[PDB]
Every structure is written in C-alpha cells, then in structure tokens.
Design a protein around this ligand. Structure first.
Ligand SMILES: Nc1nc2c(ncn2[C@@H]2O[C@H](COP(=O)(O)OP(=O)(O)O)[C@@H](O)[C@H]2O)c(=O)[nH]1
Ligand SMILES: [Mg+2]
Lengths: 171, 351
C-alpha cells in the first residue's frame, strides 16, 4: 500500500497521569502545557519503521475520569494494543491499574496486546511508585513495562515501538 | 446616532441569519452579539441575557418559561425603554440568544462566516460564535449524570490547571485574557497540576491584591473591572471558576454523539490539520444581588449525520448552574450543592 502494517492503539488510565502528553510527544516530539483536557476521545497518527517494515499506528487517546468510562469502553474492542498509564507520583493512579486491566478483560479483544507505562518519572522528589513495585506486578501478568517522561522524552519512543513489535510478532 | 444596544436589538428582530445582510454587516453583528452574556435568571425565566457595550448602552433580554421575550434598552443617557420581542421563523430570534430550550430536537445553527476549521484560532472563534446561540437541553440518567457515580468532580483541579490560560473566559462581561487567567491560576494556589487550592482561598477567597492584579491585566470597562475585583474576593468565586472546567459535564451530550466526533477527529488527523481536541468558553456573572451564575461551553468538532457526508461542524455543550452562597471550593462540597443543567447544539459552516 503506502504502509506495510496498520495497527490500532489505545491509551487508557486515570485522568492526568499524562496520556495525552505521551501521545503528543510520540507524534510531534513536543511537550506543552497549553491544552485543555481530553473530552471523550482524541486521535493521532504516526508512522514508524520496524524490521525494515513501515508501520502506521492509529492511536486513540481516551478521557480517564470515571463518568467517561462507558463512552471510552466502546473503543477497546477495535484495538491491536492497549497502553495502561499511571502517574508514578500518584499512588491512587497505580492502584487503579487493576481495574483498567479488568476493563481490557471486559471490553478489548481476547488476545489484545497490553503495555504498562509509569509516567512523570522525571519528578523524582514526589515519586511514590518504585520501579520494582510496578515491574513485579507487570511481570506477574506477562505485561511489558516502562517508566516514562513525556516532558523529557525519556522512554516515550521506546514504549510505542515495544508495543508495535509486540503486535507485529503476534501477526 | 443609534446606540449599540439598539443596533443589536434591530438585528435580532429582523433576524441574525437574514439573507438581505451583506457579509460585511454579518461580521459587524457577530461583534455586537458576543457582548451578550448569560446571567442568573429570575424564578419564572427560562434564561436571562445581558449586554453592556462600550458606548455606555446596555441591553437586558429575558425569556420566560412560556417562551415570551422581553428586552430592556438602556441608552447611554440612562433612558429605560422596554420592548416586547416576538420570535418566529424569519428572525429565529430565540435561536440567537444564549438560552437553553426544551426542544424536541437538538438545535442546528449555521455559522455566519467562513470559519474554515483548519487550526486553533478557527475553532476558538467558531466556539466564540456558538456560545451565543441557543441550545437544546439534554436529560441524563444515573449512568450519564456527570455528578453521579463513585468519584464525581475528581478531576476539576487538574481540569482547572489545564484550562486556565487556554480558555476564553469572562467575568461580569470582562474578558480575562491568557496572562490574567494564568495569574488566576496561581491566585487559587493551583500552581502545579497535582495540587488543590489553598486553605485560605477555600475559606476567604482570593486575596484582594491578587484580584486587583488580575483585573488590571484584563480587557474591559473601568466600572466593570471593579465588579471583577469584588467578585474574586468571595469564597464562592473560587468554586465557580474551578467547577466550570469539569470535563464530564460533556458526558450527557457525547453519549448521544461521540462516534461522529471521533469520525471528525480521524478525518482531520489524516489531513495533518492541527486542530485542538476541544475548546472551552466560560462565562460567569454575579448579579447585583450576589447571585453567581456559571455558563460553561465546550466546543468540539463533529461530522454531519450520514445524509450530508464529508461535511464537518461543531458540537457545543452548554452547562449552566448557580453557585449558591457559602458553597466553598471543595470537591465534596460541589457534589452536594451544585445542580448543573446540560444542553447542546450542532453548528455547521454555511459553506
Ligand atoms: N513533569 C511532568 N509532567 C507531566 C508529564 N506528563 C504529563 N504531565 C503533566 O500532567 C498534566 C496532564 O497530563 P495529560 O496529558 O493532560 O493527562 P491526561 O488526562 O491522561 O491526557 C499536564 O498538564 C502535564 O503538566 C511528564 O512526563 N512530566
Ligand atoms: Mg488527555
């Protein structure tokens, strides 16, 4: 075509953990604080090269506040992969990963790809979720995991490529 | 010779979308029409609207629940004329006021100029227009109710941080620009996205000095500026501001429409059009009785039903509510005091 592969990605997680920030960093290599919140669902496209193959990613960026969940869930079953984000400075956000994974269990395709991302890892002072606490949890579910900083670009690119490769492998 | 309040009142009666108006006249009207702000309605009023122009003339329109319309002109020489207005099909008067109606169908407007949705400024401007036109009210049930569920309002402070400096915001008709909104951001104690407002503001409101600084940086009349300072010094002014940004106000309306909104998001992301996801336009007024009314708008791009395919317009959600006295800026306190009323409209570029 004009792309070798077409993958659909979903960002999922509590409000304000940084899902839009991560997406805008991956799609435009910018970080700004001059955007209103995500109302409903946002959408960005980016192409990557992997194993020489051109891959077109279609990333849906959901709103994470509770009331939005029912609208949000309608987008799961389309996705090739779902990224669950939490804020590493915010304990309650990590605690909620369990439910989000239940949402994936309830709504997404039975063998969708799951990645876990711990954002705002540049705020080291206020950091409350340690790598080992998260890794071990992710390990227990066969889920890949990275800490990232949309602000510093730290592991943002790596995240999506890992997700991509993981889907690629699956087909 | 003829005042602003009067000019506009001629227009609304002849009709905003009347075909006999040259395009250069339509722009000169949208300039007059944007002075219109919603305000606290009295007990029998379906909605009340107010405009205070720079030529010193004001205008107060009120629509009763029986949909009867009454305007009041105040000339720059303080004369008090009172007109009875009739809305019908050639004027669409009722449609060109910021009022929530009980229609059997969501209202559909046509943009008055070439607001071709390419970028941010296009979108904001269109929302600038739609914020002043009518909307159809939408009921919610327990599941789509923004205030129901296990954690209502949990996101307002985050929403407030992201919104301030990125919204179009008016208090008592005074436009508070980005710089000022950013001072107000810091004035609430919401310096960083992870904080709550200070125990001092929650209790006593913004400090007098902060308020005066914000009102100096703002565009608007000198008398009006003073009302803004007095508004900001209230514990309830913090409540009004923060709540107006609540993201889930938009849930009743999207429930009816999101698939079409997403369609527009994709359509645009494919053409590399750098169009924001959502725009916010807030309008808050304190009556000369102390009554605080919030009217909060969210505009969002939307695709026409599959009857006029590939046509794109804007979906506008209006949230109106009173902030009663003594309702301090707290999530727990907002959830039990505030009683929002959600409403929407679809606007498409006549193009
Ligand atoms: N320091 C830091 N702040 C971040 C980072 N990512 C997001 N934030 C902050 O969190 C706020 C909300 O992020 P946002 O993307 O809107 O969260 P969302 O609700 O999932 O879209 C932003 O205004 C940023 O200031 C990060 O990697 N580092
Ligand atoms: Mg977002």
């Amino acid at each position: 075509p004009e792309y070798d592969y077409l993958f659909k990605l979903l960002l999922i997680g509590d409000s304000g953990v940084g899902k839009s920030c991560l997406l805008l960093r991956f799609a435009d290599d910018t970080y700004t604080e001059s955007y209103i919140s995500t109302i409903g669902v946002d959408f960005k496209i980016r192409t990557i090269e992997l194993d020489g193959k051109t891959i077109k990613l279609q990333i849906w960026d959901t709103a994470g506040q509770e009331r939005f969940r029912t609208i949000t869930s309608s987008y799961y079953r389309g996705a090739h992969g779902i990224i669950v984000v939490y804020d590493v400075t915010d304990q309650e956000s990590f605690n909620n990963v369990k439910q989000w994974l239940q949402e994936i269990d309830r709504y997404a395709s039975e063998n969708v790809n799951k990645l876990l991302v711990g954002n705002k890892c540049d705020l080291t002072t206020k950091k409350v979720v340690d790598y080992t606490t998260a890794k071990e949890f992710a390990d227990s579910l066969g889920i890949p995991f990275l800490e990232t900083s949309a602000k510093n670009a730290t592991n943002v690119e790596q995240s999506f490529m890992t997700m991509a490769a993981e889907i690629k492998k699956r087909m | 010779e003829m005042s602003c309040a009067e000019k506009l009142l001629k227009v609304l009666s002849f009709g905003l979308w009347n075909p006999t108006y040259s395009r250069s006249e339509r722009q000169s009207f949208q300039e007059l029409l944007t002075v219109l702000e919603p305000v606290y309605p009295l007990p029998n009023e379906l909605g009340r609207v107010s405009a205070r122009f720079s030529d010193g003339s004001s205008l107060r329109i009120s629509v009763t629940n029986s949909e009867s319309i009454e305007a009041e002109i105040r000339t720059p020489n303080n004369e008090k004329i009172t007109v009875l207005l009739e809305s019908n099909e050639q004027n669409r008067l009722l449609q060109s006021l910021p009022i929530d109606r009980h229609m059997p169908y969501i209202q559909v407007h046509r943009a008055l100029s070439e607001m071709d949705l390419t970028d941010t400024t296009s979108m904001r401007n269109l929302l600038g227009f739609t914020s002043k036109l009518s909307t159809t009210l939408i009921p919610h049930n327990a599941q789509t109710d923004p205030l129901s569920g296990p954690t209502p309002f949990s996101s307002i402070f985050m929403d407030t941080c992201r919104g301030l400096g990125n919204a179009k915001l008016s208090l008592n008709g005074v436009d508070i620009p980005a710089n000022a909104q950013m001072l107000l951001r810091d004035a609430l104690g919401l310096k960083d996205t992870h904080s709550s407002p200070t125990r001092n503001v929650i209790d006593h409101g913004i400090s007098r000095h902060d308020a005066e600084q914000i009102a100096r940086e703002s565009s608007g009349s000198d008398k009006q500026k003073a009302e803004v300072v007095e508004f900001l010094c209230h514990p309830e002014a913090a409540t009004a501001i923060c709540s107006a940004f609540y993201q889930s106000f938009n849930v009743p309306a999207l429930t009816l429409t999101h698939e079409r909104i997403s369609k527009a998001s994709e359509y645009n992301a494919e053409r590399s059009l750098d169009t924001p996801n959502a725009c916010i336009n807030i309008s808050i007024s304190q009556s000369s009785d102390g009554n605080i009314y919030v009217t909060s708008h969210t505009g969002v791009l939307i695709m026409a039903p599959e009857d006029r395919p590939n046509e794109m317009g804007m979906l506008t959600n209006r949230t109106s509510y009173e902030v009663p006295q003594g309702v301090k800026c707290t999530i727990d306190e907002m959830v039990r005091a505030l009683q929002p009323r959600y409403a929407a409209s679809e606007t498409y570029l006549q193009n």
